């Protein structure tokens, strides 16, 4: 994999020239199918293709018009690099500058980039940063300690902790530039309480403008359950398997090992598989037991009732699952093709209308040429004044597929319908 | 020279929802040549299509390229929290390459309340003549959060600064410090420090303080 | 060694009689080289002499002028002690009395002395002092004991028995207009001992008989609600946020709002009387009127809610939703032909591509209102904005006829907040 | 009777300077009935000189009496801290026996600051419908001091009482007392408490403050 290893400096005083130089690894400057460019980028002026250099059995140079009588990109072929000059500087050329492969004749894409440069075009001197310590004045399991990095000049620095051994937990916030036209941040990080008497925290700041490396030893002085259904098409297909998911979150480090009782009509049953603790980003337990439930069973409208035991509730808690009860009513299915009015755009919408469906738990499909259709929406289902249920489904396609002719259709699962299925074709008249 | 028109230039959407992303070229680009580029925060873009439909080399297969023209197309068939990252369109179909403003896709997650620190200004910043105050509000979301200050119970106005990360590509939230800033004599006038956090995940204000002197 | 212990109240009404004692240890009350003494000390007046006993082989008594009248210097040989006797006291004889050995016939120097009696000649009564802690509100730390509204002077301070005389400043009593004494006494001690040791004040008032020993130490849940659409969007109509507080039991004190407008108080809010639920809780509403162009404008609005009395509160904060708003398209459908075979078909209007989600669907026919509708909530799409369906069942022969039936759409980013799109059999 | 006239009437000195002390008789006083006398704050006065010229049991060799008829004095050598003290003339040469005025001796030191503590009224003294607050200026030398009450910044007069100790006879300085009062109504009425001090060893005035409510 080709390498790309920018250097130079970045502070450039305006009038003055910028220099960098752009190594490659992996491949040849002088390669008949490469294009070795500079790119810029700047809030406000995006992203902007400055120039390259290429080799056709002879060195071609091409420039973007802006900066044409400015720059210059230079290949080496000792060194097997190249290098960007751009003369008589201004505070428009502030951005940060990367060097880029341009591959491939038939596609000339941008495969490979450097890391970047921050150019910062002003006539103020380098300086290196302070260090101070963000210790806590004096319950809690995790503390925050962290370094306040001041008065240095130009941008970037680099922030590690305990020499790059700590990375977890760590925030380092971006640079602001303070009034007295020198830089200002905070690198922060979570660890916990009971190693802060044991444990050094050091943070490192690395500016390589100043060439410092600055040091700085910081010294210091509930559960919730969630019952989900089977998926609608699971209950209708023999060949799925539908399931109901108990899911426990807030779960305490301290107060673990949840107990899950299942009962199916009141019955305690004993085939559910629960999955074991899983941490969360935000340090607590999530744990997760799932019952295979029987077709008919939900269908019939069996009730399943997830009894959750643990020491950070007192009394246990329940919840209860079962379909809706009421008499299943049959969904009519209609296709209606775009409007005359959305013919004007390259995507058009074909509808599926799907109503007086009961009760609400149904599956909506497009298909085309027996193969899935996925840019489609389906509205949630809508209670209609006759006690049924109504949805609409959208699926957008490209309107020159649409205008060639082919035949997209929409595929209806629900319980009410023959073989639990139902499919509706829509096509160029 | 072409220009492409990037829509929307937010986009705000759940892992595991899909993401549709266009592309509008000023005039007409020869399908090999269009582009699309993935960048995270403090890196260069990387390239994730080329020729308008190729994934490119160790591209996820959620992302895939389409269109023609004038319009293409970006999508992410199931979002991922590590999607979090501005995506740019890019042709050369005419000469000079150039690159879309950007679709800035940022991840949905359910609200966290910030867990809030205070940091009194070290005894080495003080003898400097410098008084440094800071106020940290770690991994929340949404990214809208209120920093007051308060010095002995009174309301500062215009000595404080805020600074916020990008979105945390794992968990989805965001950090936030608040700098107060203050001479050393003026920061030996008062006593109590103070800085109250408003957020949509905290039902009443969080007061996190100190007294200058017990530290 | 020689001392001298006197004894005696120091208080004397005008017009009575003090009267005290010196016991003597060390040395006979007979000594033919000693003459037993009374000496009086006050401001102004000085030392001043009073008189004598001495034995000679019989008793003699000698005495100050000034008071010869008056006054009597009794020994007692069966206790060794001597006494002053002085009658008819005046304000005058205000003053610290000591008893003294005067002694060797060549030289008559006053060698030992009493330990002085403070002698206030007042009508006043006796009143003990009252004793408070004096302590910090919140290296080297004070503390005290104010021994307030005592009379006659004086009380004894000590501190913890005696065993603590380092840093110790008690001063010296001032009479308050009310004709009785007040003073402070203070200690100074380590701020490190504080937790550890115990500081005790003991205050001896012999007059009233009092010894002071003073120790020294130092439910509900809130819902805000947006404005309705239509609202915001029609000048002839009125915004609200709405602030529902659920849970509130039967014995819960008055639930109280405060608003807020961008963090600044309002206090137009109109607050609905409290109202019991089918589940016995108790639910309370407070509703905001808004500006139309300030919530467009993306303005805060936060409602506080607490409970009369209790200081605990809980706070929410609604805003018109983040984002670029964006124009709806708005479609039409006829029915589909299968629909045809029923006496009743369906209208459809998609509207799509909106933000924010902010939106009112309507239909109508003839400039009138068609109210047999049902409209699908928006749904987020892939590209950020949102879409719908609403749907509109008529007669079939109303749409056979040529009626021409209009899907009405009201959203912030269309051009008067309002589109109309017509659907006719064509 | 014989009067002593005793002068100077005070006398301030360093330690390790010489005191002279004078006491003039108004009739001639036979030398063996001439005494001199130290009486230190709450004690008798201590036999010192008798005679005219001999020390007493346990005086120290640095204080000597010289004189004869009329005209006597007693002299410290190299004054101590402890020799702080009212100094007596006795004669006893004609019936009665008569004492000089006295001379204060009081002790010159440098300049000490007093150390300033504030005292809020007692819960057991508000109960009794009386609030005494007391501020305290610990150690100072000189005597001289100012003490102000701010009741919520606004200067008191005529509600404040001070009392001063007698110059400690170790290190030579004083302490005071500034007690407040006021009724309970009208301590309630007001939240600052503050007692400012000037004096000589302070480079600008030192304030103690409480607010009624966190105590
Ligand atoms: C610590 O972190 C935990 C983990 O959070 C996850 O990870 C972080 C990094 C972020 O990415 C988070 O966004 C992410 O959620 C938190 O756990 C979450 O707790 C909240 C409660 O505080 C839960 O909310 C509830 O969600 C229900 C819906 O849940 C489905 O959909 C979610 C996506 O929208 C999905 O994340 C869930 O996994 C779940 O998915 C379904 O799972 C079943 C079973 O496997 C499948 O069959 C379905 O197909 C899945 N469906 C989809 C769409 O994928 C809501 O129904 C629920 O609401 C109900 O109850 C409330 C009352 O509480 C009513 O008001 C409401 O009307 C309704 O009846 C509720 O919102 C969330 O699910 C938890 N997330 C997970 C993954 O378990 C902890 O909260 C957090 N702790 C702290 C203190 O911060
Ligand atoms: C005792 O009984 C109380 C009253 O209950 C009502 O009456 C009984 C008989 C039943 O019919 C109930 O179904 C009925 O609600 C209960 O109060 C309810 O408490 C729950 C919380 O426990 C509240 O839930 C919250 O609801 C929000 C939406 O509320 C709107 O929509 C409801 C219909 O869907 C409607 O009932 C509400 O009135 C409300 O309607 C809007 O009102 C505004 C203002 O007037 C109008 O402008 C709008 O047009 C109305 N819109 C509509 C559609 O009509 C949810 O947003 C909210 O969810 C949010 O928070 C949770 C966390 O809590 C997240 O998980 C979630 O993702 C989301 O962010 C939440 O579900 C409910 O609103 C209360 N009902 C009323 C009427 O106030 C008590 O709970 C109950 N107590 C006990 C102990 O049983
Ligand atoms: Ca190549
Ligand atoms: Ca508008």
């Known amino acids: 994999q080709v390498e790309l290893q920018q250097s130079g400096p970045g502070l450039v005083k305006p009038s003055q020239t910028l220099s960098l130089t752009c190594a490659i690894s992996?491949?040849?400057?002088?390669?008949?199918?490469?294009?070795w460019s500079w790119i810029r980028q700047s809030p406000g002026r995006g992203l902007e293709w400055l120039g390259r250099?290429?080799?056709?059995?002879?060195?071609?140079?091409e420039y973007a018009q802006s900066v044409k009588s400015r720059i210059t990109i230079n290949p080496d072929t000792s060194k097997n690099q190249f290098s960007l000059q751009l003369n008589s500087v201004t505070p428009e050329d502030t951005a940060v500058y990367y060097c880029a492969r341009m591959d491939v004749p038939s596609f000339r894409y941008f495969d490979v980039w450097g890391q970047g440069t921050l150019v910062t075009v002003s006539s103020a001197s380098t300086k290196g940063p302070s260090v101070f310590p963000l210790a806590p004045c004096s319950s809690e399991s995790t503390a925050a300690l962290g370094c306040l990095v001041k008065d240095y000049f130009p941008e970037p620095v680099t922030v590690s902790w305990n020499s790059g051994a700590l990375t977890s937990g760590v925030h380092t916030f971006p640079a602001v530039l303070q009034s007295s036209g020198l830089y200002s941040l905070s690198s922060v990080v979570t660890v916990p309480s009971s190693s802060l008497g044991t444990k050094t925290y050091t943070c490192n700041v690395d500016h390589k403008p100043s060439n410092t490396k600055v040091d700085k030893r910081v010294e210091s002085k509930g559960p919730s359950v969630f019952l989900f259904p089977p998926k609608p098409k699971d209950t209708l297909m023999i060949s799925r398997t539908p399931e109901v998911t108990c899911v426990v979150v807030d779960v305490s480090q301290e107060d673990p090992e949840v107990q899950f009782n299942w009962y199916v009509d009141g019955v305690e049953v004993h085939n559910a598989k629960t999955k074991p603790r899983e941490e969360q980003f935000n340090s607590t337990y999530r744990v997760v037991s799932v019952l295979t439930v029987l077709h008919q069973d939900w269908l019939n409208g069996k009730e399943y009732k997830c009894k959750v035991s643990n020491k950070g509730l007192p009394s246990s808690i329940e919840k209860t699952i079962s379909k809706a009860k009421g008499q299943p009513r049959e969904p009519q299915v209609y296709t209606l093709p775009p409007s005359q009015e959305e013919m004007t755009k390259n995507q058009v919408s074909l509808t599926c209308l799907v109503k007086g469906f009961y009760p609400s738990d149904i599956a909506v499909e497009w298909e085309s040429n027996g193969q899935p259709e996925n840019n489609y929406k389906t509205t949630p289902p809508v209670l209609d004044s006759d006690g049924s249920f109504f949805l609409y489904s959208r699926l957008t396609v490209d309107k020159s597929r649409w205008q060639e002719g082919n035949v997209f259709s929409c595929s209806v699962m629900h319980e009410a319908l023959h073989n639990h299925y139902t499919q509706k074709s829509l096509s160029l008249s | 020279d072409i220009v492409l028109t990037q829509s929307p230039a937010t986009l705000s959407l759940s892992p595991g929802e899909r993401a549709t992303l266009s592309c509008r070229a000023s005039?007409?680009?020869?399908?090999?040549?269009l582009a699309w580029y993935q960048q995270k925060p403090g890196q260069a873009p990387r390239l994730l299509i080329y020729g308008a439909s190729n994934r490119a080399t160790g591209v996820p297969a959620r992302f895939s390229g389409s269109g023609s023209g004038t319009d293409f197309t970006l999508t992410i068939s199931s979002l991922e929290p590590e999607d979090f990252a501005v995506y740019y369109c890019?042709?050369?179909?005419?000469?000079?390459?150039?690159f879309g403003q950007g679709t800035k896709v940022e991840i949905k997650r359910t609200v966290a309340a910030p867990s809030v620190f205070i940091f009194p200004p070290s005894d080495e910043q003080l003898k400097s003549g410098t008084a440094s105050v800071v106020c940290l509000l770690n991994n929340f979301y949404p990214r809208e959060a209120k920093v007051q200050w308060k010095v002995d119970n009174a309301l500062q106005s215009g000595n404080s600064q805020e600074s916020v990360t990008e979105q945390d590509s794992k968990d989805s939230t965001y950090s936030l410090s608040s700098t107060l800033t203050l001479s050393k004599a003026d920061y030996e006038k008062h006593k109590v420090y103070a800085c109250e956090v408003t957020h949509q995940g905290l039902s009443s204000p969080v007061t996190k303080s100190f007294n200058r002197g017990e530290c | 060694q020689v001392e001298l212990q006197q004894s005696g109240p120091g208080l004397v009404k005008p017009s009575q009689t003090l009267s005290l004692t010196c016991?003597?240890?060390?040395?006979?009350?007979?000594?033919?080289?000693?003459?037993?003494?009374?000496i009086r000390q006050s401001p102004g007046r000085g030392l001043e002499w009073?008189?004598?006993?001495?034995?000679?082989?019989?008793?003699?008594?000698?005495?100050?002028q000034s008071v010869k009248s008056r006054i009597t210097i009794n020994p007692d040989t069966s206790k060794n002690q001597f006494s002053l006797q002085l009658n008819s006291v005046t304000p005058e004889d205000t003053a610290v009395y000591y008893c003294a050995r005067m002694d060797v016939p060549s030289f008559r120097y006053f060698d030992v002395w009493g330990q002085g009696t403070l002698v206030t000649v007042s009508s006043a009564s006796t009143k003990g002092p009252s004793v408070f802690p004096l302590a910090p509100c919140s290296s080297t730390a004070a503390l005290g004991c104010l021994v307030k509204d005592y009379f006659p002077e004086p009380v004894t301070v000590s501190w913890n028995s005696g065993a603590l005389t380092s840093g110790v400043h008690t001063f010296p009593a001032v009479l308050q207009s009310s004709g009785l004494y007040s003073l402070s006494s203070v200690v100074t001690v380590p701020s490190s001992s504080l937790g550890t040791k115990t500081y005790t004040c003991n205050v001896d008032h012999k007059p009233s008989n009092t010894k002071v020993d003073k120790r020294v130490e130092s439910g509900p849940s809130v819902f805000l609600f947006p404005p309705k659409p239509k609202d915001t969007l029609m000048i002839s109509r009125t915004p609200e946020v709405t602030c529902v507080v659920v849970d509130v039991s039967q014995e819960d004190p008055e639930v109280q709002f405060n608003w807020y407008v961008d963090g600044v108080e309002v206090h137009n809010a109109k607050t609905k009387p409290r109202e019991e639920q089918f589940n016995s809780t108790y639910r309370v509403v407070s509703v905001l009127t808004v500006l139309h162009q300030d919530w467009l404008n993306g303005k805060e609005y936060k409602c506080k809610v607490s409970n009369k009395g209790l200081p605990s509160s809980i706070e929410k904060t609604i805003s018109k939703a983040k984002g670029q708003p964006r124009e709806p398209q708005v479609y039409t459908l006829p029915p589909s032909q299968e629909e045809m075979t029923k006496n009743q078909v369906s209208l459809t209007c998609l509207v799509k591509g909106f933000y924010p989600s902010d939106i009112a669907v309507e239909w109508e026919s003839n400039g009138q209102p068609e109210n047999n509708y049902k409209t699908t909530p928006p749904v987020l799409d892939s590209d950020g904005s949102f879409f719908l369906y609403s749907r509109l069942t008529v007669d079939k022969s109303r749409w056979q006829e040529g009626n021409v039936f209009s899907c009405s759409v009201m959203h912030e980013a269309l051009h008067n907040h309002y589109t109309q799109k017509s659907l006719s059999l064509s | 009777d014989i009067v002593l006239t005793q002068s100077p009437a005070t006398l301030s000195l360093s330690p390790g300077e010489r005191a002279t002390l004078s006491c003039?008789?108004?009739?001639?006083?036979?030398?063996?009935?001439?005494?001199?006398y130290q009486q230190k704050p709450g004690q008798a006065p201590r036999l010192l000189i008798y005679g005219a010229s001999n020390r007493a049991t346990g005086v120290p060799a640095r204080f000597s009496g010289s004189g004869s008829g009329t005209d006597f004095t007693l002299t410290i050598s190299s004054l101590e801290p402890e020799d702080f003290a009212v100094?007596?003339?006795?004669?006893?040469?004609?019936?009665?026996?008569?004492?000089?005025?006295g001379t204060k001796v009081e002790i010159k030191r440098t300049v000490a600051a007093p150390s300033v503590f504030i005292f809020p009224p007692s819960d057991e003294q508000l109960k009794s419908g009386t609030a005494s607050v007391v501020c305290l200026l610990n150690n100072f030398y000189p005597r001289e001091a100012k003490v102000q009450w701010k009741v919520d910044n606004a200067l008191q007069s005529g509600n404040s009482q001070e009392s001063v100790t007698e110059q400690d006879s170790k290190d030579s300085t004083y302490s005071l007392s500034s007690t407040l009062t006021l009724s309970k109504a009208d301590y309630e009425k007001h939240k600052v408490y503050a007692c400012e001090v000037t004096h000589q060893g302070l480079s600008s005035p030192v304030t103690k403050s409480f607010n009624r409510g966190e105590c």
């Open positions: 250099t290429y080799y056709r059995s002879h060195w071609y140079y």
């Open positions: 890019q042709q050369i179909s005419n000469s000079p390459p150039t």
């Open positions: 992996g491949d040849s400057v002088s390669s008949r199918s490469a294009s």
């Open positions: 005039q007409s680009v020869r399908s090999n040549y």
